[PDB]
Structure 1
C-alpha cells in the first residue's frame, strides 16, 4: 500500500497548536506523513508532496506557491492563495457571503451586517455618520489576515474609546445581537460548532446550508465563521467574521476530522 506526503507550511505558533503528536500519529497510522516545509529553501527544491497545506502570508510565499502550482497541477493546495486573499481585508471578507443569496427561505434567514470603514484619524474625529451610531460597536482592523498581533475583533462602549483605536478599521453595530456569538468551524463538507458569550442554538440544517454556501462562494476547504441571532425577529442570523484556517486545535477530536479530510483530499 503506497504512502502520502502532506507538506505543511505554518508559522511556529500555529505549528505548535495545529501539528500535535495525536494528529501526526493518527495520520501516520493511516499512511499519511505530515512533513514540515523548509522556510529556508524554495518549495520547488523541497520533496515530492501529495497535498500541500499552509497558512503563510508574503509576496515571497505567494510566488513559490504559484511556481509549485504551475509545475504540479495534480497536487491540491489547501488553500489556493487567490481564495485566501479575499478574506484578508475585513470589509472584502463578507463580500463573498452575499454571493449565495439563493440559499434557503425555510423558517430561518441569514444576512450580512452593514459596515463602516474609517481609513484616517482625521475622519475618526470629523465623520458626521460616526455620531448617529448605536453602541456597543464591534471594531476590527480593516486588513487583518491573522499575522500582526492586534488582528482580532474588539468592543467599544464609550465614543472616547473609539478615538483611541488605530485606523484603518471596520465597524458594525452589536445592538441587535442579543449579546451572543456562535463560532462555526468548517473542514471541507464537515461542520462543527461552538458557543461563546460575547462582551437558543440555530437549526443544524441551517448552519449546514450556510457552511455549504460559504464553502462554494469562498472556494476554501478550511475556515470558520462567527454568526449572531438578530434578536428583533427571534429567528434570523448574521455572518460577522470569516477567519481562514482557524484554531481547530481548540475543538476536541479535530485530529480525526482533519485526518479524515487529508484522506479525502489525497484520493481527490
Structure 2
C-alpha cells in the first residue's frame, strides 16, 4: 500500500558528491552529521561547503543542499560579507548547471517575502480551483494607519480580526505579530502584511515537505476569537512543539473540526514544488472552522522538521530522485500540469 519505492534509484548514489551549506546552529539542530554518515553508506561523498573560498576547489558537486535564507536576507540588507558569499555561490551555480541546487535561490527569495509568498499561494490556488482550499484575504501595508486605512482594508477584503506580520519572513523580529480586532486597534507597522484571522480550533498542521514525501505534524496554534486591545505575540511562543500559553488554549471546539486532506496536501505540494522549484520546505495549514477549507498561512524554506523522524531517509530519497530526474532529463515544460 506504499507503492513508491527508492531501492533502484538509490543504487545510483554511489560516487556522487553532495555539498551543503548550513549555519552551525542549523547543523546542530538537524544533527546534520548523522545524515552525512547515512549518505556515505550509500557510497556518497558529503562535504560542508566553505563559501569564503572558491567553490571550484570544493567540487565537483552533483548536488548542493543549503539553507542560505539568512545570508540572502543579510545580503539584501547590504551586508558586505553576505553579498560576497551569495555572489560566490551564484557565480558557481551559473558556471555549473549540472549541479543540482536544493533549493534554487529565486524560490528562497520568494519565501523570504510574505507578500510575495501569499500572492503566489493565492494564484496557485486560483489556478487549481479546489473548493477545499481557501486563500485568506491579505494585503501589504506600507504606511502607518491614517484616515483612509479602513477603506483600503475593506476594499481588499480584510476584516476584523486580522493578523499583522512582517513582510520579511525570516530573521530578527520576523516572528513578531499582532492581532487587530477593531478600528481602535489599527496603531498595530509597515512594511507588514495583514491577513484575515481564520478560527481553526487552535490546531496547526505543519506539512513538512521533502520533495516527493511529506509528513504532517500537529502543533499548537492560536485559539478561536470585540472592543479589546490588539494582541502582540511572537510566533515561536505559539506553534513550537512545547508552546503553551493562553493564546493557544482553545476555549471549546467550534464549527468544522477535521484533519487536512492528503489529497489536498498532495496537490498543494506538487503545485508549490513545480511553480517555485522548491523541495525542502514547510506549509502551515489550518482548517477553517466555518467552511472546513484548508488555508495555507505560511510557507517556509528548509524548516526544522521537528517531529519528522523520517527526515534523513526522505532527504536521501529526494537526492536519489533528483539525480534520477537529471540523469533522464526529466525537465518540466510549459505551465504547472495539475
Aligned pairs for 1:98-177 (under 5 A) are 98-99=123-124, 101-103=126-128, 105=130, 109-120=132-143, 122-123=144-145, 127-129=149-151, 135-144=160-169, 146=170, 148-152=171-175, 154-156=177-179, 163=187, 166-177=189-200
User: Does the CA-based 8 Å contact 2:210-2:311 persist in structure 1?
Assistant: no
Higher strand share: 1
Q: Distance in 2 between matches of 1:204 and 1:112?
A: 18
Using structure 1 for the length normalisation, give the TM-score.
0.84
| Alignment coverage as a number of residue pairs | 261
Q: Does residue 1:44 correspond to 2:45, yes or no?
A: no
Per the normalisation by structure 2, the TM-score is: 0.68
Whether the aligned pair in 1 keeps the contact of 2:125 and 2:135 (CA below 8 Å) is no
**Structure ranking higher on relative contact order (CA contacts 8 Å, 6+ apart):** 1
Report the CA distance between 1:185 and its aligned residue: 1.0
Is 1:217 matched with 2:265? no
Which sits farther off after the overlay, 215-224 or 40-49?
40-49
Larger Rg: 2
Kept after mapping to 1: 8 A contact 2:125/2:133:
no
CA contact (8 A) 1:100 1:217 kept: no
- Aligned residue number for residue 253 of structure 2: none
Q: CA deviation at 1:206?
A: 1.7
Alpha-carbon RMSD? 2.7
Residue of 168, 177, 182 corresponding to 2:205: 182
The answer on 1:34 being equivalent to 2:46 is: yes
Partner of 1:7: 19
Given the superposition, is the C-alpha separation of residues 263 and 162 from structure 1 closer, same or farther in structure 2, using an over 3 Å criterion? Answer: farther
Q: 1:175 deviation in Å?
A: 4.0
Whether the 8 Å contact between 1:137 and 1:174 is mirrored in structure 2 is yes
- Residues 94-145 of structure 1, C-alpha deviations (whole Å, 9 max, x = no match): 222223534364xx5213211132224x33787334897655533321022x
Seen in structure 2, the aligned counterparts of structure 1 residues 237 and 124 have a Cα distance that, compared at 3 Å, is farther
Equivalent residue number for residue 317 of structure 2:
260
Number of the residue aligned with 1:80: 104
- Structure 1, unmatched stretches of 5+, are none
